[PDB]
Amino acid sequence: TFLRWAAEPEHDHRKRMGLKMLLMMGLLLPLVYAMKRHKWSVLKSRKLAYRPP
Amino acid sequence: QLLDLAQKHFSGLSGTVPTLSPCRFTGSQICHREDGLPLAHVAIAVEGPGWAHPDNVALQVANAIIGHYDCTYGGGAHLSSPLASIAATNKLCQSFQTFNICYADTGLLGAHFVC
Ligand SMILES: CCCCCCCC/C=C/CCCCCCCC(=O)O[C@H](COC(=O)CCCCCCCCCCC)COP(=O)(O)OCCN
Fold this sequence. Notes:
PDB class: electron transport
Organism of A: Bos taurus
Chain A: Cytochrome c1, heme protein, mitochondrial
Keywords: mitochondrial electron transport chain, antimalarial, electron transport
CATH topology of chain A: Single alpha-helices involved in coiled-coils or other helix-helix interfaces
Bound molecules: the ligand CCCCCCCC/C=C/CCCCCCCC(=O)O[C@H](COC(=O)CCCCCCCCCCC)COP(=O)(O)OCCN
CATH architecture of chain A: Up-down Bundle
Entry title: Crystal structure of bovine Cytochrome bc1 in complex with inhibitor F8
Oligomer: part of a larger assembly
């Protein structure tokens, strides 16, 4: 246990950040994904019509 | 005399109900691309208030500020409307009009340009 800490003092801080990164990404990934779908909805919905005389 | 004549000729007319459903407005785009035509027409409008509303006055003031333009219009660069002076100055279009089209409880408020 001491030898792990000696090799990687950061072990605990890193793991705390990991949690906060996972949390923020849980928020931000569906959020931005939703933003994407909104803008693109104009295009996703569109219907095409060919009408030569 | 008009009223008499009305009574005389029209009184057989029936008065005995088609009333108008609200009309739902929708933000939308319709594009007929036809490259073979020589100029493009664009009409754009927001939902307006409809015949009765007192906003139509203030809206028509605003529409008049922005105005209408046609490439025969003498005013050109010196015109009062920024849209028109800029459109004349930079040959942005042949023409445009603001409109406020009024219906029962809805309308088209905007502008059409050819360019
Ligand atoms: C010009 C400005 C540049 C800014 C870039 C904008 C980033 C946009 C995307 C963000 C992704 C969302 C996930 C981030 C999780 C952040 C959570 C968090 O607070 O973590 C940070 C470390 O995280 C972190 O350090 C994680 C950050 C991950 C960002 C890496 C991408 C950018 C590369 C930077 C390289 C130069 C510190 O947490 P603690 O030490 O507990 O501090 C407590 C609060 N002050």
